Ligand SMILES: C[S@@+](CC[C@H](N)C(=O)[O-])C[C@H]1O[C@@H](n2cnc3c(N)ncnc32)[C@H](O)[C@@H]1O
Ligand SMILES: Cc1c(Cl)c(C)[n+]([O-])c(Cl)c1-c1noc(-c2cc(O)c(O)c([N+](=O)[O-])c2)n1
Ligand SMILES: [Cl-]
Ligand SMILES: [Mg+2]
């Protein structure tokens with residue numbers, strides 16, 4: 001880092017307003033700061049509640065997140081994981097990864113979440129043999145939108161999905177992931193559900209796609 005950034009200001013706002021070890025207060029602080037002061041690409045409170053419902057329904061034991069940013073969604077999912085369950089979050093921006101680690105420490109979720117430093121297209125094919133992953137129980141896609149489809153394909157080709165694995169994809173309407181949608185909605189290897197919501201901190205309509213893997217063809 002070379003100066004003050006939006007992401008550093010978000011982290012400072014958490015550290016000055018939230019309660020350490022209280023994930024809810026961390027999420028409220030980030031949402032308050034980004035509603036009142038600086039828009040940011042956190043998944044946000046409205047879409048977060050859909051995320052909350054998915055986590056509580058499927059109780060995943062191992063979650064992979066693509067795109068950590070400041071750690072909002074990592075904190076948001078990890079606080080609802082069952083004891084022993086784990087979240088891996090991939091982040092290629094080292095400055096963001098350092099912020100995310102500080103957010104996890106502050107929220108008290110550092111023992112449940114591991115930051116993988118690097119790009120998803122490089123790390124996903126290495127998950128089985130470098131990070132000892134068998135299969136993933138849930139995947140949250142929220143990185144650059146042109147990577148949703150090839151990384152989904154990569155998750156499939158690398159044998160990281162099993163029957164019942166949950167793919168939850170942010171931003172499928174805005175900025176929009178039409179190619180990802182057409183793939184998962186048109187493949188009999190996925191059962192899809194679209195969740196109406198709003199772009200974080202705005203009243204532009206957005207949505208999440210839940211795509212449940214059904215096993216190989
Ligand atoms: C929208 S932010 C994620 C926000 C986070 N999921 C939340 O709701 O709090 C997208 C992040 O993905 C990272 N990113 C983009 N492409 C990536 C890739 N191929 N592999 C790993 N990280 C990537 C960017 O650095 C950025 O931090
Ligand atoms: C803010 C905004 C508005 Cl007001 C309008 C009208 N439109 O059309 C657009 Cl496209 C945007 C917009 N740009 O980027 C994002 C965004 C949101 C994410 O949740 C996310 O994850 C990522 N990302 O790049 O990872 C990007 N949203
Ligand atoms: Cl919101
Ligand atoms: Mg997003």
Ligand code: NA
Nearest residue numbers: 083084085111
């Ligand atoms: Na634990």
